[PDB]
Amino acid sequence: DFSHITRNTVWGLWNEGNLFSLSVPELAFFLQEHCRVANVDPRAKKSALVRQVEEILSAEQQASATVPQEDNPHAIVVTDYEEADEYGDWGAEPGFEDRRELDFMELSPRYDPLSPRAFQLLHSETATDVGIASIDPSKLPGQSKVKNALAAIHVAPNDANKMRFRMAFEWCLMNIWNMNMPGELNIGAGKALYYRSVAKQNRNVMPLWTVQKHLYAQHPYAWFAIASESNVAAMESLAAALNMSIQQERTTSYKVTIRRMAEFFDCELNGQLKCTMMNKPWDRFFVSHYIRSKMPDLRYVVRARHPIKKRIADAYLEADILRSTRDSVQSVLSPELGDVVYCCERVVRKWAKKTATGVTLQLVETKRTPLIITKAGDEGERLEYEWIVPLPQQAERIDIAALTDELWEYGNKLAAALEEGMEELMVH
Amino acid sequence: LHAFVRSPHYRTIPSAGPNGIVVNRDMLVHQFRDFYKTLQHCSLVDKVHLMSERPSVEALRVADQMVSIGATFLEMPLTGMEHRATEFMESMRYVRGAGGPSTLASYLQDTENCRCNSGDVVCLPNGIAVGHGPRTNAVAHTTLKQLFEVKDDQFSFDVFTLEQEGDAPPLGDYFGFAGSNVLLTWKDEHGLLAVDQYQQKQPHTEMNVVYLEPGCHFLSFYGVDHTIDVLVQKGYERSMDSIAAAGLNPIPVQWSEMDKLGISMRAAVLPLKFFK
Amino acid sequence: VSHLSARNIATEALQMKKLHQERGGNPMLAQQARRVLFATSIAGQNLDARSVALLLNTAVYFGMESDAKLVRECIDYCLKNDKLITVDVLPIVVTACATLKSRDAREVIEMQAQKAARNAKFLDAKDVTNIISAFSKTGINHEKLFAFLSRRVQTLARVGEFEAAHLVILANAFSRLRYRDKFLFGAIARRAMSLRERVTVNELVPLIVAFSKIGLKDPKLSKRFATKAMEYVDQMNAEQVASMFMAFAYFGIRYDQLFGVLTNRAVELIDEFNAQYISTTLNAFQRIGINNPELFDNLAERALAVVQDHDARDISKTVTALAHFGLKDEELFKRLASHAASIADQFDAMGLVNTAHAFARTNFLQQDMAVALSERSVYVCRLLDAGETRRLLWALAKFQVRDPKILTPVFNRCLALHYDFFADPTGSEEIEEIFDFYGPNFCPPLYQLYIS
Amino acid sequence: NPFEKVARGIAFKMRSKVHKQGYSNTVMAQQARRLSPTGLLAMERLTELTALQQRHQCTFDPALRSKATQILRTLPLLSIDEDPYFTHTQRALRLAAYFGAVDLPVTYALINQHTKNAFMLDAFSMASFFYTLAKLKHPQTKEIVGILLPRLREVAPELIAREAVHILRLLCSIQMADAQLVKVVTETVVATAADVPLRDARQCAFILSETFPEEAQRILGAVEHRLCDDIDMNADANEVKTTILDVCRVVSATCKGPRRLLNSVARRSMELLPQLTPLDVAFVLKAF
Amino acid sequence: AISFAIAAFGRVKYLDKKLFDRFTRWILDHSKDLNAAELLLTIRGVSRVMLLNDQLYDDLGSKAAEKVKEFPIESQCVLLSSFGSLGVEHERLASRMVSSIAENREELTDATKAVDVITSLWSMNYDVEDDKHVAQLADWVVQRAEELTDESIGKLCLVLSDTNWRHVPLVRAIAEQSVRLQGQQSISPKCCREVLDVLGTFMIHHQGARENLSALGRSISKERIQLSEEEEQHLQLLL
Amino acid sequence: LLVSDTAPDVVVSRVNTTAFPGFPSNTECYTLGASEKDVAIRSRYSKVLQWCCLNMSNLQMDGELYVDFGKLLLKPSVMRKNRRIVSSYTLQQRLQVNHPYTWVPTLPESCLSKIQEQFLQPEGFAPIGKGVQLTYSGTIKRSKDQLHVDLDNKGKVLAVNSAWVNLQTAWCTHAKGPDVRLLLRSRPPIRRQDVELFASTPIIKLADDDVADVLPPEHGQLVYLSEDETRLFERVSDRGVTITVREVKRQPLIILRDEEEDPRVEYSLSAHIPANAAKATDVRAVGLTAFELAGRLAGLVAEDFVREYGCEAKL
């Protein structure tokens, strides 16, 4: 017959089981051109032609459509020894947007140390976020009755980073208020050096989403805190720039990790060598890495401490001997209260002030000399700088957005203060 | 047809149990796996499930919680067992894992005052036997009279309250029962008294009796199925011949060290019936 | 106004799947099942847990995704009714909602993981292996669940409770899941060892493959597996031959007697070689270093017979392996070059540069593939790493390519990555070659960066 | 070669992923289902008009038409391709027909919509439209029929006979009927003569007897045997009298008649002698 | 041509959706004037294509219940099985329709049809402990409990186990017939498992049935681990 | 959905950290770095184009590439809860449910002096054929589908084709200047009985000044008809590819919807890819060339697009 009958049309008709809704000349043409049959008697009725077409179509169909939804041994495969859909371009994912607003963070469904409950990788040069803005399309030929029309515009990375930071911060504030644990906030300066095994598929260029999931799942990363002495006087100028006030001079403290067979604990032996605090290790509730182009990077941490009955703490108190004089740990512990794992000398120098929002802001410079340590071979002198800010209470009615913005800008100011302070080595 | 056992704890297993004789910690673990293999081959139980590990060695007694008389179950009363009630919770899980909750013995657990122990109640063809002694009250016998009793030409079911002395062990320990009208009994005072008490009840039973030397632990179950086999400790040899002369195939198993621990065949496994 | 009884529909779908799977699978049954299932719709009826899992399983089996109405209606009643799912019907649902790309098809799995994490202790052997097999294919990496299930497997394997059919499933699932533990694999090996003479070759080779896929192990384990492989060589075909040969190569232990007997027995079934897995058995030699030439010539003789089957990866790996022990036989090489030129449309960056490097190594340059590969290089030069970029640039240098559109992007990339480009000592000679072939005119920045 | 097989499988799987049950296609379909802002008030107006039809049909009370003609005077119900079945348009047309609304601009606008959207009308909707517009003797029926006639020849072979009767009545009462759809209706009737009410066949044979005699002759010959059996085995005098009178009129008008039917009519007219009115006898004798 | 067409379509399972919708609407419009031997020809046809309609089935059930004497015995059995297959329930139809099958009990070919009727009545969510007509059917099965086979015994055991029916003489007859069937090696292990299960649930000893059926019944329920010869010889050393 | 000045990727790098006490080995050192802007966009576009063209050639169909200049406008539906920073994936997924985009093709006419000064002749673009051709373009809404008709200046129908279907859609936005919306198209088949039928029945009648529609109601309905002044330029870049530039200064005459009542002059670039590029022709090269040479014309007319006609306040 004519050209309107094609392979797609006949395939669709065959799959819907309606091949008989066609005329004899159409089937004859299809057999004589598509199936490439020798010759057809121009007398056969509908049934013979339909059966011939059907058999030819089924015989030449060899692309299996079924996927085996079962387990089966004896099958040998050598393959190991979404990416196209990662950008979301080949269709409309059904049942989207009907989920809790957790796009900016990775949340997976109790106390556990070294277990980030919410990871959020960030960057300054690269930001995967577009913006929208208003325009006046009245000039355009046809839009002479609409006054506002939105257009997609790119945005500065810093604003998007701040928006994601505050979006996470409000969630963290609400969560910690619901739990009502003692809230602490830390902003540390240092390098977040990662491990080589992070790069899946052994590739280099990858979108932020995949690396975020990989970091949140495998955790092939380690945080390192380090500063320089040459910037000390320099940041003292920052003190004069920010009217810092000394609340504590250089103090020598013996940090110890009083571990045990059931739980872990920590203590801070004083110069007189007694135990004055008893507490659990910190609970990592939220971690954010702000990576800059150059050496100085920032780590934002929200952590809380679980409560403990004071009866057992009083039972511990100073009953556990922890003397570590003469550079030797002569801690004469009871046979089964616990054990000492790590010990480091901390030289502490801190300032203080009152922020505009109305929360205390402690800047500390800490020099570390790890003396006793078992899990790793840490040694040498290291200098670290960090901000401690306790989160406001739920009943304090303190506004949230301005506080987060002020903290972000103060972290940026501290970064700029030591931005040239870490110029010693050729980091990049 | 469902049997539950619990593996021992190697770290907290105590030597020199409450009889003045030391025990070998490794030998218990060595013998337990062979016991498992014998139990899963001996064709007396349909399935065996391996319970998880727990610290207390007194938790090795899988039984003494819940008794199966028919399609329904009966939990044991909480009287002096509170100190381990927690682990009892775990056990039920495994049961419910492959079985229903049945009646939950609401009628038995909540029967005002209750004193019951798994082993005082032993099933029998168209019969139940309750060992009234220092462990079971008459209130339990009355409750079973109310529940598991039917009387007719074909709805024939009976309950026997057997008297025993204060120093006697639980009923299911010494005098047991095996299919095809064979009745196993210790040749001691307790066994003779139990046999006489049973004989005075229902003379028409026509139950053959085979005697075993005292101090022998054996496991035998009626079951919906009929089988000719018994589990006997690999100690006293004469009992094996005595029971084999009657046409019953015996199967030996080693329980020397666990006997010194004080653990019997009845409490080593937990029989259950699961239906649809 | 009129619906279809979903329970009887599920029963008929089960029968249809059983008939389709066990007979050969003419597309008539698939179209019949799709036509019947498209009109089916779960509704104000009261289907229980089984009658929903069965329908979901059959629908996904017969080639359906979240586009269909039934799949969308069946992925619900699992978002909201979670307690109904039991261990008997957990693997069916979990492995049914695996290849689905919907977001709601990835939340369900999460919930299931939780409901398995606290229940990995109260399971038998069959339930444990079914759940592990179901969760292997999805891709989740919940660590607590895997630790609990590993413990339970170790506890169950202490006293023999695994038939010689679930060890393969467990080992394959753990190996594909990319989770390593010495104790679990040791226990599985010991249990497989206890069941002597029960495991056939058809049930032995997959265990070896799974263990080798996690080859970061210690000796004395493959040592014993070498002993068992001695008596299972007779009644096995070329597929397991090549697979276990690659596995033993990846183990990294020289088994002179095992390799010798494998070579001796492999020549009889040279006819069965379909030329698709010849690449693996050729590349494994390069992996270990054994240079037996007899079977190499035997393999090379069975090449022209089957080349159409050869794919891009197959050709690339074969030429890379043949680079070592260079026969340079032009008769095969011309046909292979032409065939790869036809296939050259679909390829891979890293594979692209190995193919170019091997062609430059063999010193057989013809215009067609040369120009084709030079054309296709530009699309992949963006993501190559330092040494790979150097190798591709030298491949173009050997190709005598002067087109500015080709050399400009690679020169830009190497300029942007000069530090790593100039820091490779082993490749140093290579960089030498390139400049003294081309000259100083092209990239003056590269000039004074080298001269430094 | 394996890559080509994989590509074929992937391409055909992705092709089969697209059908009429897709999420996006359903979303667009429901978007098209959304009514216009004036559509809601148009349905309310239709409901208000419907609420009075039964009261006017039962009570016959006056002044009910007042405030009921005015409420339909300004009816913005247009619904261009919002209901591609015209069922609401047909309902409004019938409601205007019962109220005497003939010369109002709303009716003319509805007819203009009918004549401007005359390429998606099926057999049933057009048969219903031609059932009305005859009860409403519009002054301009000729032009409407002339415009709609070329569509008649397209949807002709899907009409029940009971509506083809009224179609032919309307087409022959204005001399506009052409000999192109008449043959189609005659072919349908002669094809389905096995099971078709005899009243309809008699009406169809009589109606076009004046202009086209051969088609009426063929229609009569299609059901001659059934008509003879009916006129023989029946018992009620009224129906047999009407049947013989009508068949005699058809035979006289066509100037030809089958033999067996005439014989049966003869004997029946003999048996029915008492109820024969003088005009009945006159027509019976005239038929011969 | 509607009942004939519906029966011809439902005898081969080629349901056509819109055509069947129009058929159902037509037979709903004119329903009060359907002669007997046509409800039977349409209920089976519309139930073999798995159509779950409430109003249509309600109307057809009411019409069939109104006219009961016209339907013969086999028609009664088929009309009960047609409703029973899908799972729809109708109290009036079953109550009015089991009376005729109880009164004309003696014309049944054997007891297999009786147990089939009882099973189909169970599937329709009708109480089986109801008035003495089911009791008459059960007693007739008991009296002639020699023509039963494996399938009938299995279905009856399933019905008793699910319904919790204490009536023992039929259980005794089932046990005796199972023994006799095993006597000529014409029984299946699943039937033995089912009869042992119901016996255990209902607490009847019947030692004769327990003895000879044990080996057949235990072979399906007992899960056996396949062991190698070395472990077999280790076990032989152990016991 | 692509926005310029983007970089949704991260680059692997490593550095030598020999001044850190504790784990000073550089093997376990990993660092992140930025990337360039255009490379990611071009790579993604080329990959998607290659996949779409491979699929189209696998389905035995023909299609053509299209490049058009204009502007993009979005309904307030996409914006929600007064948010101004949205993920690109979220926006792309949100613009796929109701199609709230309102693209209107346009370009200011006061640039033709410098349009010819865009290296037209150096690239190969030359003026061929006859310019300022007068024609009409109309569309018909049938019972099931839509048809497109090209009418001559006299009134005779020139071609009767089917409605266009877009396979690959690309909406690469831009700066204050115009943005480009690269597309891939295919033409569905049509019964030649309908082709012949819409040649005898008159569609339009052309009076001295006014034009009227005469299409019989049974055949369909006239829903959009406009007058076109066309001229053409052609280039072949020694590869068999025919890059064609067309001019349309259309003035709509018969309209149905409301947002088309204004004179509109717009540009268009096109190529031709028959059903054989799956084996011989390099498809991605044509797309890369078209994207490269569209940016030039976007940059040149960027000034006057916002200077005297138009206002693009992107802030």
TrEMBL record, chain B:
Pfam families: RESC5 (PF26170). InterPro entries: RESC5. Residues 1-276 form the RNA-editing substrate-binding complex 5 protein domain. This is RNA-editing substrate-binding complex 5 protein domain-containing protein. It comes from the Eukaryota. It comes from Trypanosoma brucei brucei (strain 927/4 GUTat10.1). Signal peptide: none annotated. One of its GO terms (cellular component) is mitochondrion. SUPFAM superfamilies: Pentein (SSF55909). GO terms for molecular function: RNA binding. GO terms for biological process: mitochondrial mRNA processing; RNA metabolic process; RNA modification.
UniProtKB/TrEMBL annotation, chain C:
One of its GO terms (biological process) is mitochondrial RNA modification. It comes from the Eukaryota. InterPro entries: FAST_kinase, RESC6_dom. One of its GO terms (cellular component) is mitochondrion. Residues 16-403 form the RNA-editing substrate-binding complex 6 protein domain. One of its GO terms (molecular function) is RNA binding. This is RNA-editing substrate-binding complex 6 protein domain-containing protein. It comes from Trypanosoma brucei brucei (strain 927/4 GUTat10.1). The lineage of its organism: Eukaryota, Discoba, Euglenozoa, Kinetoplastea, Metakinetoplastina.
TrEMBL record, chain D:
This is Mitochondrial RNA binding protein. It comes from the Eukaryota. It comes from Trypanosoma brucei brucei (strain 927/4 GUTat10.1).
From TrEMBL, chain F:
GO terms for molecular function: mRNA binding. Residues 1-305 form the RESC1/2 CYTH-like domain. This is RESC1/2 CYTH-like domain-containing protein. GO terms for cellular component: kinetoplast; mitochondrion. The chain holds residues 159 to 473 of 473 of the full protein. One of its GO terms (biological process) is mitochondrial RNA processing.
